[PDB]
Amino acid sequence: GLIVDTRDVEERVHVMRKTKLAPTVAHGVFNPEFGPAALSNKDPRLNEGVVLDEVIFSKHKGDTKMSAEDKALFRRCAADYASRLHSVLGTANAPLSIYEAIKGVDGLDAMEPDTAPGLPWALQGKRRGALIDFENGTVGPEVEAALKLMEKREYKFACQTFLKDEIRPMEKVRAGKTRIVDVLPVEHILYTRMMIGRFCAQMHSNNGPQIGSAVGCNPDVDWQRFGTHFAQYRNVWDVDYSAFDANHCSDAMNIMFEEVFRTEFGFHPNAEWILKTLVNTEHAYENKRITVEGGMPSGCSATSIINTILNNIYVLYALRRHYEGVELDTYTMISYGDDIVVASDYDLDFEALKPHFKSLGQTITPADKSDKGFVLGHSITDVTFLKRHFHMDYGTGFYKPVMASKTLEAILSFARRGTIQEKLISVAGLAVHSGPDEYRRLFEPFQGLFEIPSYRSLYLRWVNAVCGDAAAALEH
Numbered sequence: 001g002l003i004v005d006t007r008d009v010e011e012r013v014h015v016m017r018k019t020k021l022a023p024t025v026a027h028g029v030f031n032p033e034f035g036p037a038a039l040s041n042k043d044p045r046l047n048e049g050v051v052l053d054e055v056i057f058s059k060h061k062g063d064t065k066m067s068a069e070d071k072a073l074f075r076r077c078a079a080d081y082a083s084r085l086h087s088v089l090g091t092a093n094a095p096l097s098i099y100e101a102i103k104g105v106d107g108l109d110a111m112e113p114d115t116a117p118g119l120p121w122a123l124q125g126k127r128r129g130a131l132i133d134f135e136n137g138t139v140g141p142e143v144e145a146a147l148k149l150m151e152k153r154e155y156k157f158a159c160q161t162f163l164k165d166e167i168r169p170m171e172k173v174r175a176g177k178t179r180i181v182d183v184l185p186v187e188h189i190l191y192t193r194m195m196i197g198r199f200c201a202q203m204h205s206n207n208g209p210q211i212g213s214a215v216g217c218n219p220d221v222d223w224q225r226f227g228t229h230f231a232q233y234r235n236v237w238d239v240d241y242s243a244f245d246a247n248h249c250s251d252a253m254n255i256m257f258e259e260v261f262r263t264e265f266g267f268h269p270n271a272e273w274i275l276k277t278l279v280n281t282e283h284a285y286e287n288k289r290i291t292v293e294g295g296m297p298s299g300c301s302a303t304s305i306i307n308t309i310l311n312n313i314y315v316l317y318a319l320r321r322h323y324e325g326v327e328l329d330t331y332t333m334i335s336y337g338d339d340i341v342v343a344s345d346y347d348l349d350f351e352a353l354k355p356h357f358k359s360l361g362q363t364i365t366p367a368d369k370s371d372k373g374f375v376l377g378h379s380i381t382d383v384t385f386l387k388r389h390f391h392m393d394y395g396t397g398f399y400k401p402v403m404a405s406k407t408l409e410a411i412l413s414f415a416r417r418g419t420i421q422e423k424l425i426s427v428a429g430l431a432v433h434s435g436p437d438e439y440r441r442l443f444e445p446f447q448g449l450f451e452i453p454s455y456r457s458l459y460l461r462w463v464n465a466v467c468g469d470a471a472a473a474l475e476h
Contacts, residue, residue, distance in 0.1 A: 064361030
């Protein structure tokens with residue numbers, strides 16, 4: 001995005017805390033090159049002269065202006081992807097009821113009852129529970145009033161900026177590259193869910209290469225589905241972006257929203273409008289109010305679908321800008337926000353697409369970290385997606401999501417205080433795919449102190465999870 005105004009203000013949005021993450025017993029064994037992100041300017045691990053306030057917003061270097069020809073190409077690519085999307089999903093996109101918006105529907109989780117409420121409710125000491133009855137799926141009078149302002153397209157708002165208290169590579173910790181989440185007002189989230197919730201549910205239910213989205217996938221079971229699909233292609237690419245979310249230009253975002261969320265596809269006219277409120281945003285951080293043009297508000301969960309849709313349109317755009325006769329079936333892909341796997345039987349030159357992605361304000365590199373850029377001949381067993389590799393289990397022949405051992409060492413090395421037992425059982429579910437020897441090694445530090453699930457128990461759970469009849473067949 002482009003920072004068009006930075007001004008000081010009364011009311012500090014107090015967003016410089018201490019980490020709830022503490023080292024575990026594993027920290028001293030593994031000595032990871034990771035640590036909690038800096039949550040304070042006075043953090044002694046920060047490099048000399050690094051200001052948190054400056055670095056967290058440094059990703060906003062501009063709002064790339066696309067030419068008329070490029071915008072008309074982008075619109076064709078958006079309308080072509082939308083055609084595919086709404087063909088698979090259908091056009092049952094009537095607004096969600098307030099009850100359904102809060103409680104969710106099949107394929108869409110209920111709203112979180114006690115997460116951050118956003119502005120100005122955070123400054124008035126009003127928690128989410130004060131504004132919305134999540135039990136009954138009803139709203140208080142303030143949310144009710146704000147919903148009626150959005151009906152009229154008169155709603156205005158500020159994004160509350162929170163630092164992401166999490167583990168980061170030590171080099172990113174020192175450089176002050178703390179990640180941020182933009183918390184929009186709870187009523188804005190409610191209304192967005194009203195406008196596109198049915199669509200969001202359908203995309204979760206229909207995740208797969210056909211719609212180019214892994215949002216709402218279960219890697220445990222869906223790696224088999226994904227792996228057998230990409231294994232069929234001569235060429236597979238994993239594509240790295242630099243600040244994908246920030247670098248979505250106003251032109252791209254606006255056109256995507258216009259082509260994807262049309263009334264003719266069953267959407268309320270206001271679906272396009274509430275999404276378009278994401279383009280030109282005001283961000284509250286401490287005493288600062290930063291106005292940005294372009295980019296998606298920072299996040300993962302809340303913005304996954306939009307980022308995934310843009311990734312799909314970007315690949316069609318980039319290939320059509322370089323080659324003639326490119327259609328959706330020229331390649332296959334799956335995306336989860338900025339994360340992407342692309343495959344084609346065609347020898348697509350991804351190295352030559354770099355300038356074409358640059359016309360969208362996006363910088364692509366091979367995920368590989370090759371000294372050269374993109375190459376042909378890569379397969380599904382070479383790539384990373386959701387921090388997971390695709391490897392066949394020798395026992396069953398099924399693809400399993402294998403995470404890098406260094407990443408599992410880092411995850412096991414820190415925990416929120418009092419959560420260690422819960423975290424071990426969760427991370428065991430990830431580490432089981434590393435094999436029995438590495439699984440044993442990763443949890444050795446915790447043996448005798450916590451309950452570590454047997455490798456055997458999680459392996460048997462997994463085989464049943466991915467194919468029920470296969471597990472049954474082994475008792476022939």
